[PDB]
């Protein structure tokens, strides 16, 4: 089954369709575009009746060839009625937001977070005790780390997620959401964490208020700076080997280039293309133990994107040891596959 033949590109959510004739992705044209076609495209990506809006935007990508729509066709697929074209009647392409995400109301050495600042933050408990966190990306799905749900914890009935709550003493049974499924990455290597990402599904979909909201996943072609201004949060130990924090802290870290994070005085080429370091080589800010899987978000275009998820580290209050996170950008396709293949 191969059905990831449509995608959104970059911060503007430029809908694209794949053409084997040119073996390239071409943005769709806005002329004669049905909005129900946009709804269908959103469903074909794994969105349970989640559709925000479609609008025409002058192409913000770098494609000279487009995909015009044949309105004389009928009862065919999206790729069947789209034909290659080098221009648009209206100088605008299709922009497709398939969900309302990325809006928020606005850890060692990280100031406490206010309610509504990081609504996607999740605290996952195993035995009424917080093990690690995740990220709300959909009323049902959560993005976390694979090393969190290693055996014996790979069964879905151990876990209960507490989203919308910032206090760990107010996370009582009957406040969280039982997890239906836990879908770790098949290519997760425990010895050397490479594809350390995992999912979680809830029996009861989350209701989104100012306190609870999703975080946009990174579409392809997200031009991020070599040192982009990111944010982290979680209930980790504020002191090396300290106890779990009662309150949800936040910190302002900066992405570190992979070419620099693999030097000899650093993790020494241990970082694979599936991982992204963040933090400071000087130190004083990192995601310590207890906030694994936690969000690493970045703001761009008024949207917070799940850049990565906490994976591992060699120490928190240390220099030349930035936090290492999974590259959610790499895993977005697998995430979409697992979200589509729900039920079958």
């Amino acid at each position: 089954d191969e059905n990831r033949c449509v995608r959104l590109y970059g911060p503007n959510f430029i809908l694209q369709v794949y053409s084997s004739q040119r073996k390239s992705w071409h943005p769709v044209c806005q002329d004669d575009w049905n909005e129900n076609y946009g709804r269908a495209a959103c469903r074909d990506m794994g969105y349970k009746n989640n559709f925000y809006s479609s609008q025409g935007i002058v192409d913000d990508s770098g494609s000279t060839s487009f995909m015009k729509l044949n309105t004389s066709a009928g009862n065919v697929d999206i790729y069947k009625k789209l034909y290659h074209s080098d221009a648009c009647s209206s100088k605008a392409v299709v922009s497709l937001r398939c969900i309302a995400c990325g809006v928020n109301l606005n850890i060692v050495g990280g100031e406490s977070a206010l309610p509504g600042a990081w609504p996607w933050q999740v605290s996952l408990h195993v035995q009424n005790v917080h093990v690690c966190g995740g990220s709300i990306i959909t009323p049902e799905w959560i993005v976390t780390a694979a090393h969190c749900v290693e055996k014996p914890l790979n069964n879905p009935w151990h876990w209960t997620a507490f989203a919308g709550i910032l206090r760990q003493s107010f996370m009582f049974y009957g406040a969280g959401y039982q997890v239906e499924k836990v879908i770790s990455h098949p290519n997760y290597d425990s010895k050397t964490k490479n594809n350390d990402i995992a999912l979680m599904k809830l029996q009861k979909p989350l209701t989104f208020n100012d306190l609870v909201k999703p975080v946009c996943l990174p579409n392809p072609g997200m031009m991020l700076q070599p040192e982009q201004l990111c944010w982290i949060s979680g209930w980790g130990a504020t002191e090396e080997k300290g106890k779990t924090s009662e309150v949800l802290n936040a910190a302002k870290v900066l992405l570190i280039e992979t070419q620099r994070c693999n030097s000899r005085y650093v993790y020494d080429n241990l970082i694979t293309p599936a991982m992204i370091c963040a933090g400071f080589l000087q130190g004083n800010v990192d995601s310590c133990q207890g906030d694994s899987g936690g969000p690493l978000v970045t703001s761009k275009n008024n949207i917070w994107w799940l850049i990565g998820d906490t994976s591992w580290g060699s120490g928190c209050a240390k220099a030349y040891r930035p936090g290492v996170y999974g590259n959610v950008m790499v895993f977005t396709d697998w995430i979409y596959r697992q979200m589509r293949a729900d039920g079958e």
């Epitope: 509504g116 206090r167 003493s169 107010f170 208020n209 306190l211 609870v212 504020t238």
Partner: antibody, heavy 122, light 112 residues
């Protein structure tokens, strides 16, 4: 738009029955604040019954009132209800509906209701 | 569980003086930099009125005479100068964990 919590009026009810105390919340985004319930027998200090999250509906009942007071919300009309079961003479008191802080972070009640005097006798 | 103990059960003070009400907890209510001890005021026939929250923060609309201090287990509420309108019952409340609980109250009295 000053915030207001408006409770129902006094209730004279027979022992063994139940009474549903309502508290309509206005002047703020309902689902963003927890709504707490507190009891106070005449000249006897305050007593925390429990809270209920309007956004989700999760209710915490103090072990004393678990199995006696059930908390429910009406998100459509922005109203909160408390139902007392098997009312006895002791159940008579003044019940206050209060609204916690923004995220229910501090767990303190900044706005309260006027109180609802409950009399339980035959 | 935590049970707050509030003493004295009643305190009579002349107008213009300082009235100090002390609340103590079974175990520390301070953690992560926040002291979860809040002070209320209830007058005859009125619902309580949050004066101080988090043991040092004055709620908006409250006179600056009311002062909060303390950490861990020991907390104090100060009223100085004491006005005639300050005669009421003052409750200390812990929100460190669940269930939240109140103090037994401290009925204030005015000497005249």
């Amino acid at each position: 738009d000053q915030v207001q919590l408006q409770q129902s009026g006094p209730e004279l009810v027979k022992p063994g029955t139940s009474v549903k105390i309502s508290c309509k919340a206005s002047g703020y985004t309902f689902t963003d604040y927890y709504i707490n319930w507190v009891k106070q027998r005449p000249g006897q200090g305050l007593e925390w019954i429990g809270w209920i999250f309007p956004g989700s509906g999760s209710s915490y009942y103090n072990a004393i009132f678990k199995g006696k007071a059930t908390l429910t919300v009406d998100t459509s009309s922005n109203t909160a209800h408390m139902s007392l079961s098997s009312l006895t003479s002791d159940d008579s008191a003044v019940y206050f509906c209060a609204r916690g802080d923004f995220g229910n972070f501090g767990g303190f009640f900044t706005y309260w209701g006027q109180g609802t005097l409950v009399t339980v006798s035959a | 569980d935590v049970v707050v103990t509030q003493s004295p059960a009643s305190l009579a003070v002349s107008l213009g003086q300082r009235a100090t009400i002390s609340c103590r907890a079974s175990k520390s209510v301070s953690t992560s930099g926040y002291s979860f001890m809040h002070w209320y005021q209830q007058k005859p026939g009125q619902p309580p009125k949050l004066l101080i929250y988090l043991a040092s923060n004055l709620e908006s609309g409250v006179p600056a005479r009311f002062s909060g201090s303390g950490s861990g287990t020991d907390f104090i509420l100060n009223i100085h100068p004491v006005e005639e309108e300050d005669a009421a019952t003052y409750y200390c409340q812990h929100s460190r964990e669940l269930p939240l609980t109140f103090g037994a109250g401290t009925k204030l009295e005015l000497k005249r």
